[PDB]
Short mmCIF file of C-alpha atoms in Angstrom, two decimals:
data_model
loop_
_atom_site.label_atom_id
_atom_site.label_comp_id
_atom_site.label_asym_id
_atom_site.label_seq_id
_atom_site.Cartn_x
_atom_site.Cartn_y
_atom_site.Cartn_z
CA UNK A 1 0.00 0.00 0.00
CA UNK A 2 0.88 3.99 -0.46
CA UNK A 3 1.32 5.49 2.80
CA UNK A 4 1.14 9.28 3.22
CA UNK A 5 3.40 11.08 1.61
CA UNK A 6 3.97 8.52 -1.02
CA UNK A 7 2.56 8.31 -4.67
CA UNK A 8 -0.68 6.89 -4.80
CA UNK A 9 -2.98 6.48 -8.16
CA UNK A 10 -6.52 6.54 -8.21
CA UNK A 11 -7.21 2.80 -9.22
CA UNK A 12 -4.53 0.62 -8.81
CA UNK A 13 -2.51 1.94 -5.79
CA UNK A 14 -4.63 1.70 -2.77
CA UNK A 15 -3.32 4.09 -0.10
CA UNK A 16 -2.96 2.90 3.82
CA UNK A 17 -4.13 6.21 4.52
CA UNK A 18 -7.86 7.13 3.74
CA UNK A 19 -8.62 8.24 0.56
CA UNK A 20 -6.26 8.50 -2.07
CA UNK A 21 -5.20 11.99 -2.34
CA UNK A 22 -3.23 14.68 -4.49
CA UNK A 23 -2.36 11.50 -6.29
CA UNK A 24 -2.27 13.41 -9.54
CA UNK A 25 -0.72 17.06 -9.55
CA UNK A 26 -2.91 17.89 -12.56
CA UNK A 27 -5.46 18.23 -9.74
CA UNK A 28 -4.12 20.93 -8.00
CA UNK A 29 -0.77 20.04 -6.75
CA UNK A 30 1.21 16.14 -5.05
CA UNK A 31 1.34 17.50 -1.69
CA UNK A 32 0.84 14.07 0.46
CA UNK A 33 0.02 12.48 -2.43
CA UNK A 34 -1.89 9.74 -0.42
#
């Protein structure tokens, strides 16, 4: 899994944190990224 911080995707890389976030910095910016 993609802990915080780390790179997640919205499909295939399920985060350890809750939702997978910032995963793409098209959508704003890769902050925590998970």
């Amino acid at each position: 899994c993609k802990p915080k911080g780390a790179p997640c995707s919205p499909l295939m890389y399920p985060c350890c944190t809750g939702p997978c976030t910032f995963k793409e910095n098209e959508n704003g910016n890769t902050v925590k990224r998970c």
